[PDB]
Design a protein around this nucleic acid. Structure first.
Ligand code: FDA
Length: 458
DNA sequence: ATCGGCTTCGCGCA
DNA sequence: TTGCGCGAAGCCGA
């Protein structure tokens, strides 16, 4: 009734006599959620309530108000949603290692379930959780169509090597979601959102005139809005996606990534609705490849390379190339603070940084250019990786995500890419030029949208 | 083996 | 712009 290959037993023990607890982390949604659909089932077999617990930890100080409101507002909407299904929602504030471990005792949980995320630190918590628990601990991949550990069992070198593996399992894992059965066995935020903002308030990004840089109206948060972005994409942009996706002057991207990041929407549902949309094959194929292949190879990459954010996980050829050019003369070198405020010589580069700063979502094509000029105008790879990680995670609404580390590592160190012509500083890593951007899209339109803002920020 | 074929490249040319 | 061929380049995998 649910494909069991979505579950990995983490810790074995005695199904306690009490409620099943869904430890919610990556997939912050109440529909299309295999981990909550499993949680409700084991609850159903033992006639207990299902509760959901969410742990709010101090990592919000590492990013900004922009991500932190996007999250807390969905969770306000989420809590309403679960409670309509008789599912209470418990919000802890502290480190998951002990908050989830005491909660399991304090509530005499019968069973623990969590969703899957490949990032280092969730495995730390999990492991510290396992150490302090006695009831069983289960994990469900509710983020990938094909559960990450089943799609491939090794780091995948390239997309064309992972693509055939994935598409063989798709007939079996691409399926419809059953209906979340509300509890029969019947079992603060705002204040938590207000406290945070004032912690984050002195670090807000401000214009010269004390005005917030960020514009909070390009992406409304929530399960319900995420579905309506998915609906406008299928209605208005799926047809043109294939052809206009690399023009940053036309808003022809799905715009779905901030929601997928927080798991405010299942990518499986998107694949589902896209698959049945009558539109252009070139568009549907190009898109399915982004949301299936490139999204899930970025989980693959984080999962099988624990150092997914360091120089050391680049390919051998890439490292040998970059190191041989460590001593080449850089034509410009900017500090972190200099990129951050768009104060380089390159008005195209400055514009994309203006787009990141003020919308929280930079155009996907521009993201390659942005990051490769970072490698070109910093004093070393390591610093370039540093600066590019720190700004992608400070300011992208979709930041702090495996897709992040795996695209940074594409751009700077050639992971899941190949070797190209050898040049100074950047070695054999793929090159992108301003003149290349010019023949592809009207760069002066892009730069005009944002050049107004540069001299306004401080 | 042993060879095509590789996300998102740049550029000259028509 | 717009599509095509050619380039330079390392490695997987049937
Ligand atoms: C320098 C740099 C930095 C980042 C990223 C790339 C690069 C080169 N990415 C990946 C990608 O650029 C980004 O997901 C898209 O711009 C998302 O915008 P749309 O949702 O509109 O994508 P669009 O509608 O074009 O694609 C659909 C979905 O496919 C997936 N996808 C598309 N391109 C991908 C890519 N290059 N890598 C992985 N999955 C991809 C995403 O889930 C995306 O929402 C990333 N992604 C992210 O989610 N968060 C981040 O913080 C970053 N950071």
């Amino acid at each position: 009734i649910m494909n069991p290959k979505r579950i990995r037993a983490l810790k074995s023990g005695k199904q306690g006599d009490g409620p099943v607890v869904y430890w919610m982390s990556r997939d912050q949604r109440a529909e299309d959620n295999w981990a909550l659909l499993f949680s409700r089932a084991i609850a159903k077999e033992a006639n207990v309530p299902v509760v959901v617990v969410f742990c709010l930890t101090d990592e919000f100080l590492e990013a900004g108000i922009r991500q932190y409101e996007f999250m807390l507002k969905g969770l306000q909407e989420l809590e309403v949603s679960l409670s309509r299904k008789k599912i209470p929602s418990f919000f802890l504030r502290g480190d998951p290692g002990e908050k989830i471990s005491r909660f399991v005792k304090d509530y005499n949980a019968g069973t623990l379930v969590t969703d899957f995320s490949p990032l280092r630190i969730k495995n730390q918590w999990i492991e510290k959780v396992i150490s302090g628990i006695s009831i069983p601990f289960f994990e469900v991949d509710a983020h990938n169509v094909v559960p990450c550990w089943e799609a491939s069992q090794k780091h995948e070198y390239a997309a064309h090597t992972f693509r055939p593996k994935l598409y063989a399992l798709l007939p079996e894992f691409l399926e419809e979601f059953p209906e979340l059965e509300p509890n029969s066995v019947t079992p603060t935020l705002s204040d938590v959102l207000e406290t945070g903002v004032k912690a984050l308030l002195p670090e807000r990004a401000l214009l010269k005139n004390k005005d917030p840089l960020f514009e909070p109206w390009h992406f409304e948060p929530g399960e319900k809005a995420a579905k309506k972005v998915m609906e406008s994409f299928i209605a208005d942009r799926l047809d043109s996606y294939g052809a206009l996706r690399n023009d940053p002057t036309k808003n022809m991207l799905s715009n779905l990534s901030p929601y997928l990041h927080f798991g405010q929407i299942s990518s499986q549902r998107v694949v589902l609705e896209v698959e049945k949309a009558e539109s252009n094959p070139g568009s549907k194929k190009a898109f399915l490849d982004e949301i299936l292949i490139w999204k899930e190879i970025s989980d693959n990459f984080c999962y099988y390379n624990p150092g997914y954010d360091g120089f050391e996980s680049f390919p051998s050829w890439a490292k040998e190339s970059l190191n041989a050019h460590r001593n080449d003369v850089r034509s410009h070198i900017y500090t972190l603070e200099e990129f951050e405020a768009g104060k380089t010589h390159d008005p195209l580069w400055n514009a994309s940084q203006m787009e990141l700063l003020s919308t929280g979502k930079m155009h996907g094509y521009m993201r390659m250019y942005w990051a490769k000029k970072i490698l070109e105008w910093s004093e070393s790879p390591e610093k370039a990786l540093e600066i590019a990680i720190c700004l992608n995670d400070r300011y992208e609404l979709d930041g702090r995500d495996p897709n992040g580390y795996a695209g940074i590592a594409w751009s700077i160190g050639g992971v899941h890419d190949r070797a190209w012509g050898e040049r100074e500083v950047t070695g054999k890593i793929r090159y992108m030029s301003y003149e290349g951007c010019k023949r592809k899209f009207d760069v002066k339109l892009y730069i005009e949208k944002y050049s107004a803002l540069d001299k306004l920020a401080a």
